[PDB]
């Protein structure tokens, strides 16, 4: 009986660690996905308000609300969990994005690795994804509050391409979450056998 118990306990300890690794990972991934959805919603609203703008004091008011959206998106781009920025890669000394869209985060991604070898990017350099999001929102807000109508059609298209960038990331992140959820279900089925 003792010999069998060595094997069952060894496996059970690997399973426990993997369960914690999956729980930790799903928290970072959920936060990431929720932040991305919050950005998608913001850019959607920015698009809508810019259509209104394209369709004197009132163009400026639209410009104002786009400014609130710019602030919300900068807040969202600076989301931090477990000591690191999810869109600021491997440095957390500074906020990774300014209100101007300048990136001051870490150059490299931070990888996490499950007990069984599976690796994913937990904290990423988000400059290419979010710097242009923010820069576009900023030019949108200024174009509107300065009554600059000619600038708006270009910026509408810029925001559409930026949003497609955020949608594709949301989808990649959804996929990683689905994988984690499959790993959990596999481990649960394996736990039942052991016990
Ligand atoms: Zn062991
Ligand atoms: Zn936390
Ligand atoms: Zn320091
Ligand atoms: Zn590796
Ligand atoms: Zn999901
Ligand atoms: Zn779950």
Numbering used by the authors: 45 to 99, 104 to 243
Q: What did the publication describing this PDB structure actually write?
A:
To initiate filament growth, three junction proteins, namely, FlgK (hook-associated protein 1), FlgL (hook-associated protein 3), and the cap protein FliD (hook-associated protein 2), are sequentially placed at the distal end of the hook. The FlgL and FlgK junction proteins that are located between the FlgE hook and the flagellin filament are indispensable for the formation of the flagellum because both FlgL-deficient bacteria and FlgK-deficient bacteria lack functional flagella and are immotile. To investigate the role of FlgL in hook-filament assembly, we have determined the crystal structures of FlgL from gram-positive Bacillus cereus (bcFlgL) and gram-negative Xanthomonas campestris (xcFlgL). The bcFlgL and xcFlgL structures revealed that the D1 domain of FlgL forms a four-segment structure, irrespective of the bacterial species.
Crystal structures for the truncated bcFlgL and xcFlgL proteins (residues 45–251 and residues 48–364, respectively), which lack ~45 N-terminal residues and ~35 C-terminal residues, were solved by multiwavelength anomalous diffraction (MAD) phasing and single-wavelength anomalous diffraction (SAD) phasing, respectively. Although bcFlgL and xcFlgL are orthologous, they structurally differ in the number of domains. The truncated bcFlgL and xcFlgL proteins adopt one-domain (D1) and two-domain (D1-D2) structures, respectively. The D1 domains of bcFlgL and xcFlgL are superimposable, with the same organization of four α-helices (α1-α4) and one β-hairpin (β3-β4 hairpin), although the β1-β2 hairpin is located in different positions. Among the flagellar components, the D1 domain of FlgL exhibits the highest structural similarity to that of flagellin, with a root-mean-square deviation (RMSD) value of 1.90 Å between the D1 domains of bcFlgL and S. Typhimurium flagellin for 140 Cα atoms. The D1 domains of FlgL and flagellin both contain a three-α-helix bundle and a β-hairpin, with a similar length for each segment. The FlgL N-terminal portion that is missing in the bcFlgL structure is relatively short (44 residues), and the terminal regions of FlgL are highly likely to form α-helices based on secondary structure prediction, suggesting that the D0 domain of FlgL adopts a coiled-coil structure that consists of two α-helices, as observed for flagellin.
